[PDB]
Design a protein around this ligand. Structure first.
Ligand SMILES: O=C(O)CN(CCN(CC(=O)O)CC(=O)O)CC(=O)O
Ligand SMILES: [Fe+3]
Length: 498
């Protein structure tokens, strides 16, 4: 069947509530649900469910003109009432969306007619349109499928306007999607997509080698990277590696001994041989990261000075800070206290473990004792939210989140970044400036504020950037060239064209 494919995902796609997070998978929410405006790789948006829009001079009131020809997959019309009901349903759960500042800025949403939708904002929020473009939460389910006139407590059928329809889901086995034959836009070439639930990366590679699946698409965790490199040379297969999409880093706890000392954080940022780490654990497949955001990220080409691998310098910094080696020991001490740092990661994630072992080795060579704390996912996320870590693996979010949304979220205390930053004298100023940068319409001031925030974060050595990672593809050749989505968390199945 040349227009049916089988792929894999580590978990089910979830219930496909458009307005909720885990266990809903973003790429799948994006398959069914659509936005008012669609994000493009150049950073702009184009008309989508909204054909056009205007705003007020003060930038607080926006009026969208909607398409008039869009139906939900169940035949019900998409109109301004439906869109307004969705916004209400999202904002009824406002607390859950704190990380996204548009959810705090929207003050009112109302359908002025079937085709006119008015959105009012607290302030002149510059990332407005890009945040409407996101996979979640501002996309649209048929209001008939609300439960008790809400979505925050669940939905009935996951009815969107999008090019794919969920056919069926079987927990821990598979999810099947079919093409929407009444889609308002271009019809996908592919008719059916089956997602086999395959949690282990090795098991995913095996499934591809046996012919059980036709396509694997995902980030650096998709399959073992040595196997990837092998497949890349195998003439029976097709593989791809995108340009980098986001940063993988450690976050260092500025509020916990001994990472509360700037000098210790500086030393750590000279201690890791990142090129080696990438060649060893990532099989040469990713790029070295010197800064939180790659220089290609909007607002982030700042000429920030890299801390290159330099164990001599790391040891000098620590000696100067009073962290010195006792007679016959390899671990430094200050005030009888050992230089001991806990590194938390997801313990069943083989790649993270491999990286953690490398980081531990490199840091031992400069007299820091890194203890590896590998735990289940829920325990790691809990550590991130409450700052119970020394160092922790973390990542940025990709386009169109990076940098404005990721920075916005640094203000939210129940996220790793806030927690890592909590010990900085200038954290309140950073948070103030993050608030300002998002509202400011003076473009000169906006660049200054991004420079200031990112520069403080860099100079304070809050992070240990490791790698700018890429999306990876393995496919049967008959599927052809597999496109990448502008939005880093989306999978553009509708663009596959054998
Ligand atoms: O996952 C969440 O609950 C919310 N996200 C907000 C950022 N997300 C977008 C999302 O979940 O909608 C980025 C991402 O998950 O890549 C927090 C996080 O991932 O750290
Ligand atoms: Fe998220």
């Amino acid at each position: 069947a040349p227009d049916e494919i089988t792929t894999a995902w580590p978990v089910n796609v979830g219930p496909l509530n458009p307005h909720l997070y885990t266990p809903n998978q973003m790429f799948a929410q994006s398959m069914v649900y659509e936005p008012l405006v669609k994000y493009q790789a150049d950073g702009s948006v184009i008309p989508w469910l909204a054909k056009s829009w205007t705003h007020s001079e003060d930038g607080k009131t926006w009026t969208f003109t909607l398409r008039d020809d869009v139906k939900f997959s169940n035949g019900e019309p998409f109109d301004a009432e439906a869109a307004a009901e969705n916004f209400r349903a999202v904002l009824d759960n406002r607390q859950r969306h704190a990380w996204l500042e548009l959810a705090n800025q929207i003050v009112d949403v109302k359908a002025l007619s079937k085709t006119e939708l008015q959105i009012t904002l607290k302030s002149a929020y510059y990332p407005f349109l890009q945040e409407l473009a996101l996979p979640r939460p501002f996309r649209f389910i048929a209001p008939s499928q609300f439960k008790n006139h809400e979505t925050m407590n669940g939905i009935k059928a996951p009815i969107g306007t999008g090019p794919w329809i969920l056919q069926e889901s079987k927990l821990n086995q598979y999810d099947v999607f079919v093409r929407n034959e009444n889609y308002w836009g271009e019809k996908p070439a592919i008719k059916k997509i089956t997602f086999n639930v395959i949690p282990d990366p090795t098991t995913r590679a095996v499934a591809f080698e046996t012919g059980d699946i036709d396509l694997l698409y995902g980030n650096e965790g998709l399959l073992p990277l040595d196997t990837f490199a092998r497949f890349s040379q195998n003439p029976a297969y097709h593989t791809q590696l995108s340009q980098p999409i986001e940063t993988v880093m450690l976050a260092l706890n500025t509020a916990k001994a001994p990472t509360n000392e700037l000098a210790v954080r500086e030393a750590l940022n000279y201690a890791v041989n990142k090129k080696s780490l990438i060649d060893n654990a990532l099989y040469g497949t990713q790029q070295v990261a010197d800064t939180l955001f790659a220089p290609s990220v909007p607002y982030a080409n700042l000429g920030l000075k890299p801390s290159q691998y330099d164990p001599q310098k790391a040891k000098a910094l620590l000696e100067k800070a009073g962290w010195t080696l006792p007679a016959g020991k390899d671990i430094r001490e200050k005030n009888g206290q050992p230089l001991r740092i806990e590194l938390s990661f997801i313990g069943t994630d083989a790649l993270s473990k491999s990286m953690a072992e490398i980081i531990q080795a490199d840091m031992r060579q400069i007299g820091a004792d890194v203890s590896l704390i590998g735990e289940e996912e829920s325990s790691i996320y809990a550590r991130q939210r409450d700052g119970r870590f020394g160092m922790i693996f973390h990542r940025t979010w990709g386009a169109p989140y990076d940098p404005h949304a990721f920075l916005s979220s640094m203000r939210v205390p129940s996220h790793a970044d806030f927690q890592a930053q909590q010990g900085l004298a200038d954290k309140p100023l950073i948070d103030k400036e993050i608030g300002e940068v998002l509202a400011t319409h003076d473009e000169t001031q906006r660049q200054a504020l991004y420079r200031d925030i990112l520069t403080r974060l860099h100079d304070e050595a809050v992070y240990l950037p490791i790698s700018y990672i890429s999306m990876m593809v393995v496919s049967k050749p008959e599927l052809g060239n597999i496109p990448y989505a502008p939005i880093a968390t989306e999978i553009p199945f509708e663009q596959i064209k054998p």
